């Protein structure tokens, strides 16, 4: 399951629209934050033992951004493999609005390769 | 409790206090949990809002309120232990706050004359 | 808790909140009861100091403590209900406090700009 929509725009053009579930995002942000916690040190303790509420407060927004970008990319690649879509050149990511704690939808626009003619 | 009491200057007095970082985190966590029970997020109903979300959005605000609450509570706990009390409005002189670190501050005020 | 939210200028916002007089009195009385439990002074065993003495000595400090606490909790409750998110740390602007009366104060801060 993923929630993917394919569209034909014009000519060799296509558009893939994907919605990432809020819980998938939260799970990703969670593990990324624990990895980031391993890198932070604060006088009062030894590196890596910083309280999660502190790491989330300070790095949550940046990490949430990183994760969104990463998930958009990974889900797109999985989508074209499953849908057997062959992009030509570099695709363009068209992100939707992101609402904290909610599902996230975006589109990816690109041209595909025409059938190899010999 | 780590308290320091300077004394005298025409009844004037100064109490410097240092709050444990852990004490700070416990208050913050409790407040954030309260917040997670009140926040409503569209499409989400499975229990309280995740803490990473709450800490990110409400962390700075909740932590500032918790620092003010603790400065006050600890000053009171301090004077109760030092068997003394202010005569006028106390002046809070905060030190630098460093995320996740012990916090130190001072409180200046006067006491009623005795013999 | 009466709440009024308004724009000042640009991303600046002001939330004005009024705290009921008895919400304050109830909180003050409760904290005074807990302070009495901790106090051992003026010849009395711990927790047995007459309330008139506890009030005369720590009433003012308790009042200050409770007001600050109520201002914070009421602000947070307010931004949650109004669904407005401060970009940084909020600035409190208290009104004048009249013992036994309602208390109105304002909180100023900026919101994040629209992503657009």
Q: Which two tokens stand for residue A78?
A: 């999985």
Distance, CA of A111 to CA of A88 (rounded, Å)? 5
Locate the chain B residue with the closest alpha carbon to C55: B85
Q: Which residues contact A4 (CB under 8 A, 6 or more apart)?
A: A16, A17, A18, A75, A79, A82, A83
* Among A18, A20, A2, residue whose Cα is nearest residue A99: A20
The answer to whether the beta carbons of residues B62 and B35 sit under 8 Å apart is yes
The answer to whether the beta carbons of residues B70 and C72 sit under 8 Å apart is no
How is residue C87 annotated by DSSP?
S
What are the chain B neighbours of A50 within 8 Å (beta carbons)? 100
Radius of gyration of chain A (CA): 18
Of B55, B59, B101, the CB nearest to A42: B101
CA A75 to chain centre: 7
Distance, CA of A114 to CA of C81 (rounded, Å)? 54
Please give the C-alpha separations between residue B1 and each of B17, B57, B76, B80, B104, in angstroms, as whole numbers: 8, 31, 12, 12, 12
Distance, CA of C84 to CA of B67 (rounded, Å)? 22
Query: How far A18 CA sits from the closest chain B CA (Å)?
Result: 17
Verify whether the Cβ–Cβ distance C72 to B65 is below 8 Å.
yes
Is C79's Cβ below 8 Å from some Cβ in B? Answer: yes
Verify whether the Cβ–Cβ distance B65 to C80 is below 8 Å.
no
Please give the C-alpha separations between residue B49 and each of B37, C82, C83, in angstroms, as whole numbers: 7, 17, 15
Structure method? X-ray
The answer to whether the beta carbons of residues A63 and A87 sit under 8 Å apart is no
Verify whether the Cβ–Cβ distance B43 to A100 is below 8 Å.
no
Residue C76 Ramachandran class (φ > 0 left, ψ -120 to 50 alpha, else beta): alpha
Total domains in chain C come to 1
Distance, CA of A61 to CA of B57 (rounded, Å)? 9
Distance, CA of B4 to CA of B93 (rounded, Å)? 14
CA B83 to chain centre: 21
Which residues, listed in sequence order, are joined to residue C2 by a DSSP beta bridge?
A: C18
Query: How far B63 CA sits from the closest chain C CA (Å)?
Result: 9
Q: Which two tokens stand for residue B97?
A: 């706050």
Sign of CA dihedral A41, A47, A51, A53: positive
Q: Which two tokens stand for residue C59?
A: 């009433």
Is C58's Cβ below 8 Å from some Cβ in B? Answer: yes
Q: Which domain holds residue B103?
A: 2-115
Is C86's Cβ below 8 Å from some Cβ in B? Answer: yes
Distance, CA of A94 to CA of A92 (rounded, Å)? 6
CATH code at B86? 3.30.70.1050
Of B29, B32, B57, the CB nearest to A100: B57
Distance, CA of C109 to CA of B61 (rounded, Å)? 11
Q: Which residues contact B23 (CB under 8 A, 6 or more apart)?
A: B70
* Among B39, B43, B76, B68, residue whose Cα is nearest residue B56: B39
Distance, CA of A82 to CA of C44 (rounded, Å)? 79
Locate the chain B residue with the closest alpha carbon to A33: B52
Give phi and psi for B69, each to the nearest 5.
Answer: -60, -45
List the resolution, Å: 2.3
């Amino acid at each position: 399951h993923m929630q993917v929509s394919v569209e034909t725009t014009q000519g060799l053009g296509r558009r893939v629209t994907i919605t990432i579930a809020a819980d998938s995002i939260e799970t990703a942000v969670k593990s990324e934050l624990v990895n980031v916690a391993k890198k932070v040190r604060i006088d009062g303790f030894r590196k890596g033992k910083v309280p999660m509420n502190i790491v989330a407060q300070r790095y949550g927004a940046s990490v949430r951004q990183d994760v969104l970008g990463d998930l958009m990319s990974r889900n797109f690649i999985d989508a074209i493999i499953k849908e057997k879509i062959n992009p030509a050149g570099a695709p363009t990511y068209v992100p939707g609005e992101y609402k904290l704690g909610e599902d996230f939808t975006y589109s990816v626009e690109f041209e595909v390769y025409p059938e190899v003619e010999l």
